[PDB]
Design a protein around this nucleic acid. Sequence first.
RNA 1: AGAAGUCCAUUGAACCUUAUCAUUUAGAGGAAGGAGAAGUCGUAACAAGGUUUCCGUAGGUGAACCUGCGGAAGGAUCAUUG
Length: 35
Amino acid sequence: PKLYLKMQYCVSCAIHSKVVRVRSVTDRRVREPPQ
RNA sequence: AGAAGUCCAUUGAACCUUAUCAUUUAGAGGAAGGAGAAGUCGUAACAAGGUUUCCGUAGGUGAACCUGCGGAAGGAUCAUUG
Ligand SMILES: [K+]
Ligand SMILES: [K+]
Ligand SMILES: [K+]
Ligand SMILES: [Mg+2]
Ligand SMILES: [Mg+2]
Ligand SMILES: [Mg+2]
């Protein structure tokens, strides 16, 4: 079988866990998911 | 013709009583704010200020402040068709 989990993070946890990272002023306007 | 005086009315000063406004003013004591080179205790905010910050509301702690509920990004995320 497979395990399905939807994770919903607050901003602080998302940054600390490195789910998202601080980007440059121009790079934070990019909305497409990473390849 | 006519004075003093006298009678009742009118105008009505001045005074007394009641109350209301306006302008000043005394007051034992209480409690606020501000200013002043080198006071004490912490370190609340500025970096993720080391528990992200802040708004409303409620409660509680020497003090800054902490906590609960809902909210904002002025966030530390403009982003999973994964
Ligand atoms: K704090
Ligand atoms: K902050
Ligand atoms: K004390
Ligand atoms: Mg501090
Ligand atoms: Mg601390
Ligand atoms: Mg803090």
